[PDB]
Amino acid sequence: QATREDKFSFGLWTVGWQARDAFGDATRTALDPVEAVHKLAEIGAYGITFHDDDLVPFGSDAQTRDGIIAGFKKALDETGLIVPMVTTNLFTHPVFKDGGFTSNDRSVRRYAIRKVLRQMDLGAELGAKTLVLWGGREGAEYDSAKDVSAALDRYREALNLLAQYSEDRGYGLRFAIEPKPNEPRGDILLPTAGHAIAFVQELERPELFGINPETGHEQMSNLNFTQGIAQALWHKKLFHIDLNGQHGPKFDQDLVFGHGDLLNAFSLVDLLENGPDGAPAYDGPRHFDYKPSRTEDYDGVWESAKANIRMYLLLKERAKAFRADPEVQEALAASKVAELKTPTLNPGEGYAELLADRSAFEDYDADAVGAKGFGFVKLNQLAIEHLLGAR
Amino acid sequence: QATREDKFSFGLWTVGWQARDAFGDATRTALDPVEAVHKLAEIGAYGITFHDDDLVPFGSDAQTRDGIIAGFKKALDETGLIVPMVTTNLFTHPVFKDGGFTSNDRSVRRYAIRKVLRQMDLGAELGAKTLVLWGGREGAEYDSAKDVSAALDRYREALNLLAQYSEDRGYGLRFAIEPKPNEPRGDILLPTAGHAIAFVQELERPELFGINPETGHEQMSNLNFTQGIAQALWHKKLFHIDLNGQHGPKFDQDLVFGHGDLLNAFSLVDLLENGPDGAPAYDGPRHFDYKPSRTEDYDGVWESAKANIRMYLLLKERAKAFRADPEVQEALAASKVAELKTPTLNPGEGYAELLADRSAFEDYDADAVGAKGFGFVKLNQLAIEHLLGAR
Amino acid sequence: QATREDKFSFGLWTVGWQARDAFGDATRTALDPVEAVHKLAEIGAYGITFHDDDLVPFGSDAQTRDGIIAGFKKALDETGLIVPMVTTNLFTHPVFKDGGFTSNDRSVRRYAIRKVLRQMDLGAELGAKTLVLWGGREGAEYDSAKDVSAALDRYREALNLLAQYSEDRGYGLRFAIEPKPNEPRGDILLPTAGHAIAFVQELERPELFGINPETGHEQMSNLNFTQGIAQALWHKKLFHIDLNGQHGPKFDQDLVFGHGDLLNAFSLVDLLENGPDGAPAYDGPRHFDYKPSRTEDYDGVWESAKANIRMYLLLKERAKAFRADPEVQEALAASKVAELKTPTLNPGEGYAELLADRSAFEDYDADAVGAKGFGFVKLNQLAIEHLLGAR
Amino acid sequence: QATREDKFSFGLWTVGWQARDAFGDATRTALDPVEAVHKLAEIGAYGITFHDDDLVPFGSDAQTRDGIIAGFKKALDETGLIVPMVTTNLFTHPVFKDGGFTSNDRSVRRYAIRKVLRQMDLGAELGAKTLVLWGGREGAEYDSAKDVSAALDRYREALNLLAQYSEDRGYGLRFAIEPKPNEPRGDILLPTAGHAIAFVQELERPELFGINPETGHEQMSNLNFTQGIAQALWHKKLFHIDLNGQHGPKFDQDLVFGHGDLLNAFSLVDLLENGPDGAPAYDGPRHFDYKPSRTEDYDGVWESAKANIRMYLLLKERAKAFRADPEVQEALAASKVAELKTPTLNPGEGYAELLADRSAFEDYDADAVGAKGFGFVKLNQLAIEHLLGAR
Ligand SMILES: [Co+2]
Ligand SMILES: [Co+2]
Ligand SMILES: [Co+2]
Ligand SMILES: [Co+2]
Ligand SMILES: [Co+2]
Ligand SMILES: [Co+2]
Ligand SMILES: [Co+2]
Ligand SMILES: [Co+2]
């Protein structure tokens, strides 16, 4: 059982995906936002997220726009769901074919900022704390078409303005850049969690910025998602997280969480949940940015929504059991995992004391240490047995 | 023809690779270091680099070690070759099986630092300006075997110490971390140029740290090498560069520069040479970190060394011609490449002035703008025709 | 300049792609088929191809359908273009979400066969020689959802029937199966040229079936396209070929031919054209199944169509220069490329005679042989210099 | 617990890998073959396999070779282990740098065949029923270095001779070609199970030839291993199987079976054991071609050997429970998996009758069928809940 304390959130564009892929028409009808709110509340979600254009059709008059916001607001009220994050669609409309913030056309860049400021207003009105930015069209198909340096300057210029506004309007938002390596552009700017983190460090108010890494996005480059999250945590830049499944380097599948690389899904829950001193290492929403397979109907849709929660809770349960097992505890000791936490240097020791320590070099028996095993296969086998419910 | 001004450098371990691979014995006999200096001098190299263990066999007594250094310096002297960079082998010896700076074993970590300090002294002695650090054994095969957070702490602890020592001693070294996603470990820490840049920003004297990206390592994850270099230059962290060739995600091939992704090799040379003024955007060594194919004998080795320089100079020549062509200037103008360099905002404009601009949103005709083409294919076609010498 | 003897053909869906991708709306209006015929004739194509549904909108009444065909035939008549191949759309309509021929649903399988029979009729009437079969929806997202063996039985069962019909109606069609590893299904059946050839060999009239490999599809799995086509030719199963560009394992890009892996596009043209007896090893249509980038308008569309032709002809010209070069001739000899064509055994020798030859084993000096280099790097370097027009 | 009925086998080179990788020295001392026989027997293996050079050091005199073989045979006798398959090392020695059967050098091709003939004799004497052929060095790093067509001719030439010798000597061996896409050559000939199957079909006696696919090798190309295995079984060419783990496209990891893509390992075990008629679909050895991680000592080596067997048995148990679950059955029925096994055409129905059925076209409601969901997600969720031991 999922509790609001689990903080499971879903994008309106997830369960609402009509299943129109690059090779075929939609196989499902449109989902009414209000119905989505009731259905998610019902399956145990604590919040919902949306792109401006997911809730209000691109180009609605203010009268329509207003009406829709009012109804949505009611649904949230009745159900108790919150809106932890909002995002803006800077990829669908043809105007954004070369990007929003980094489009070579100056007018498109001005327009993309306006579109986002607007969405920031709605977000603040609904109580959202995080603005997610997915630069899906920022990038290129050909190297000579995009000056990357100029593009990074323009990405920065735009973000700096957004932070200025939020701070001045007192919205208290946090901004999360969502990395993706490719698709739809041949190559997208800020392709990995690493590139996104390095970029944020260059903004005017870096403390207001972090990343929203997605499971399948890092897997599209065959990277270890868990290891990348660990690095994001070390930097304290994990502001949000998108969970889903993928089968390596191919199109973005966005399967249910745990339906792609299952072993990494397991190490991931372990990392987020078995944080320092019992407590989770991460406190934000556990957001599912996935798609119900094109072969399913609305029944299949609700099923897949629940499978995400289910997968996360089954994995958590096994990660807990894994760590609580005295035999794992023994294997951890033998592999010296915790010894990495002890500083390499003694207290107050510097280069000179180290250079004078003959045991660290002159009298060190590299051959003898080189022969002891780490017992890593055995620890790994113990984890998988916990995952399989065999221990 | 290569000039010293071209700054082509080679690792002793490139031409000296005996071609012992993961599945077979060495097909070439050892290359003598003095001989290497002399042959490299002859093909046009301006400098040579080496790992400690490439020059002085692991465990050589001091008399021996001393002897080799003297001979080496004499060859340097006679040919006029310099040592722009040096590195340390923290991957071959069995003691380094779980890493050097981040081994679970505390004693290996202490010994790893001592091994590098020692190599710093020699680099300082030879006039080297950069210390390259390739953390090839830092990472894991299994997620539960390595605490990433603690590993980054210990990687940082070791680098802070290295910088302290260099600065106290007045060595003037710059430190360049070299990223690699995998091999030999299942996953290596700091897998891409981005991850390495983000990491470096967290050290005690960041100004002293940068990266040494390798063409093939970014390609092992299917990333755009030119595009990652552009971001590195934007951050001003491109301290050195390793040029070679690769065919996508598979084992590290280390082919001659330009023998893998030729189009990306072309866009890379254009980026480095057709810099800001008219001047190169990058002023350091053009280092070839490649391996002569195992099927080749020493004539093949020397041929492959020259091929590296030849590919660079041929691409440079076409990159220059590309930029000088009036038809290219016209295509650049139609694709609005330079328009990206113009700030999105007018001087003195903030969010208040932007919100007041009805033309940036309320009266913006997105449909009309979305219908004009960027002419990117045509620009790409002209570039390719310059590469093929078709124009 | 392109001549009709070059046999450049294009699908109506290539230049006609409106650029609606998985993440955005169409950026171009629909292309009139008659206009398409005219435009293509002007750029040098010798033929056009299409899916039933590209020409005649799904669900057109007889009258309309008839109407369309007649205008289409007129345009061909007027222009001199032929229809070398026709294919059927079994991927767009929601009914084919689980496949056409191997849908779990039997009624869909029966419907798919009917839909193809109809296209075979139109194809025969237009003079097409080849029926291309692209099983884009044949596959699965989940392993337990598709019995592969049963799917292969049903695939075979449908193809046997089509051959039967063609032969009885006297159409004289050849069938070409087009492999693709994934997209739109998580995994597609007959994922590579290899798997498709193996399958075809199990049909009732195997001499009527071959493959239609596409450059990008094999590259999506990081395979060597030229090498796979060389195997297809060895088997005599290259019934057709789709030329385009791709940048390794990622979504299907469908770039202009030679805009992806340039070195492999070069070796491919050399293989097809520099066939034995001076003559091309392949005599069918050089078909471009590519897509004008979404950033482009109709001018970029015709520009991209011409670029496909120009790329092929520039590569052809360099592949011939390469083979005609005496130094290449000398490098080929040193590499023993042609010695591979001489049988391993002397005429009349069998295992008995080989076992009696002490020189092949007992007295063989493996060590002296293993020390000689093949000069492959030098040969590669010469190929590339020819590609760069540097020789 | 493994029984001899489980038919688990290991190559001497698996537990015997000294862990010398491409970047480092061995971390383990050599394993005595007799000791390996005893240890394997002890963990439950029914057989052992080996390359000629694993047992008898390359270049041993006949007296030495004969002694090794005799001691070997005694161990086999005393433990009751058998030798189900043997193989030949055609990749280690420098002489094989351009391949064995397909080296451009004629004399190497002759020597390669004699090395294999000699191993067939020893195989036949130890009772081996399968000869595995892994052409690790047959391929190229550069496209112009190898005539593929000539290479396939030579490959075929060598294989026909081997079948001939075997048949004449009454050895009754079956031959299994083992595909691999790359490593150690840039591109290896016959890269996937598909390509090997298509090739085998062209030999003089195809019935004696099949494939020895390895889990990681197909995953190196990001292909679906279970799905390719399903196709191999449909062709009846699965003569042997190598089980291991891999994490997508990167160097060959050869991890314990199930430690790579766990979900694919689970569906593979289901396919092999839950064959048609209750019984397994495959009855050959379950061979582990893996390597104990370089971080391990001999304790870790035996732990990893046992992990392979444990992994197989755990997955088998879960696969069995999966299929005996009435809810799973119900989901299978709802997903129509079995309906694929029913011919598409009715008994005696031909194209004439198909064309006459208006229910297959004229009166087919594509739109209504297209709207029904297949329930695939739900089925996948039950599969994973079984693997997790949650059901
Ligand atoms: Co995604
Ligand atoms: Co996401
Ligand atoms: Co490398
Ligand atoms: Co390097
Ligand atoms: Co195609
Ligand atoms: Co394609
Ligand atoms: Co392997
Ligand atoms: Co194997």
JSON list of C-alpha atoms in Angstrom, two decimals, chain A residues 28 255-256 259 290-297 299-308, chain C residues 141-142 144-145, chain D residues 331 335 374-384:
[
{"chain": "A", "resi": 28, "resn": "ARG", "atom": "CA", "xyz": [-6.69, 5.72, -27.35]},
{"chain": "A", "resi": 255, "resn": "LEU", "atom": "CA", "xyz": [8.12, 1.73, -19.86]},
{"chain": "A", "resi": 256, "resn": "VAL", "atom": "CA", "xyz": [6.79, 1.24, -16.33]},
{"chain": "A", "resi": 259, "resn": "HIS", "atom": "CA", "xyz": [10.24, -3.12, -16.55]},
{"chain": "A", "resi": 290, "resn": "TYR", "atom": "CA", "xyz": [6.24, 6.79, -18.54]},
{"chain": "A", "resi": 291, "resn": "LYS", "atom": "CA", "xyz": [3.78, 5.72, -21.22]},
{"chain": "A", "resi": 292, "resn": "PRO", "atom": "CA", "xyz": [1.18, 2.95, -21.21]},
{"chain": "A", "resi": 293, "resn": "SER", "atom": "CA", "xyz": [2.10, 0.77, -24.20]},
{"chain": "A", "resi": 294, "resn": "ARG", "atom": "CA", "xyz": [0.34, 1.55, -27.50]},
{"chain": "A", "resi": 295, "resn": "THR", "atom": "CA", "xyz": [-1.27, -1.90, -27.46]},
{"chain": "A", "resi": 296, "resn": "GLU", "atom": "CA", "xyz": [-3.36, -1.07, -24.38]},
{"chain": "A", "resi": 297, "resn": "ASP", "atom": "CA", "xyz": [-6.78, 0.42, -23.74]},
{"chain": "A", "resi": 299, "resn": "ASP", "atom": "CA", "xyz": [-7.97, -0.69, -18.66]},
{"chain": "A", "resi": 300, "resn": "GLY", "atom": "CA", "xyz": [-4.34, -1.26, -19.62]},
{"chain": "A", "resi": 301, "resn": "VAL", "atom": "CA", "xyz": [-3.68, 2.40, -18.77]},
{"chain": "A", "resi": 302, "resn": "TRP", "atom": "CA", "xyz": [-4.85, 2.18, -15.12]},
{"chain": "A", "resi": 303, "resn": "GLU", "atom": "CA", "xyz": [-3.10, -1.16, -14.74]},
{"chain": "A", "resi": 304, "resn": "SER", "atom": "CA", "xyz": [0.20, 0.30, -15.87]},
{"chain": "A", "resi": 305, "resn": "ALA", "atom": "CA", "xyz": [-0.30, 3.29, -13.51]},
{"chain": "A", "resi": 306, "resn": "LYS", "atom": "CA", "xyz": [-0.61, 0.90, -10.60]},
{"chain": "A", "resi": 307, "resn": "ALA", "atom": "CA", "xyz": [2.27, -1.31, -11.83]},
{"chain": "A", "resi": 308, "resn": "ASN", "atom": "CA", "xyz": [4.67, 1.66, -11.28]},
{"chain": "C", "resi": 141, "resn": "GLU", "atom": "CA", "xyz": [7.52, -4.87, -25.86]},
{"chain": "C", "resi": 142, "resn": "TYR", "atom": "CA", "xyz": [7.29, -7.83, -23.44]},
{"chain": "C", "resi": 144, "resn": "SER", "atom": "CA", "xyz": [5.74, -13.27, -22.54]},
{"chain": "C", "resi": 145, "resn": "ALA", "atom": "CA", "xyz": [3.43, -11.52, -24.98]},
{"chain": "D", "resi": 331, "resn": "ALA", "atom": "CA", "xyz": [-3.92, -13.09, -18.65]},
{"chain": "D", "resi": 335, "resn": "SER", "atom": "CA", "xyz": [-3.66, -11.35, -24.40]},
{"chain": "D", "resi": 374, "resn": "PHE", "atom": "CA", "xyz": [-4.19, -6.60, -25.57]},
{"chain": "D", "resi": 375, "resn": "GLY", "atom": "CA", "xyz": [-3.53, -6.53, -21.77]},
{"chain": "D", "resi": 376, "resn": "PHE", "atom": "CA", "xyz": [0.24, -7.00, -22.36]},
{"chain": "D", "resi": 377, "resn": "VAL", "atom": "CA", "xyz": [1.32, -4.72, -19.48]},
{"chain": "D", "resi": 378, "resn": "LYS", "atom": "CA", "xyz": [-0.71, -6.62, -16.98]},
{"chain": "D", "resi": 379, "resn": "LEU", "atom": "CA", "xyz": [0.74, -9.92, -18.24]},
{"chain": "D", "resi": 380, "resn": "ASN", "atom": "CA", "xyz": [4.29, -8.49, -17.93]},
{"chain": "D", "resi": 381, "resn": "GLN", "atom": "CA", "xyz": [3.53, -7.33, -14.37]},
{"chain": "D", "resi": 382, "resn": "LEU", "atom": "CA", "xyz": [2.47, -10.89, -13.31]},
{"chain": "D", "resi": 383, "resn": "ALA", "atom": "CA", "xyz": [5.64, -12.29, -14.89]},
{"chain": "D", "resi": 384, "resn": "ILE", "atom": "CA", "xyz": [7.84, -9.91, -12.83]}
]
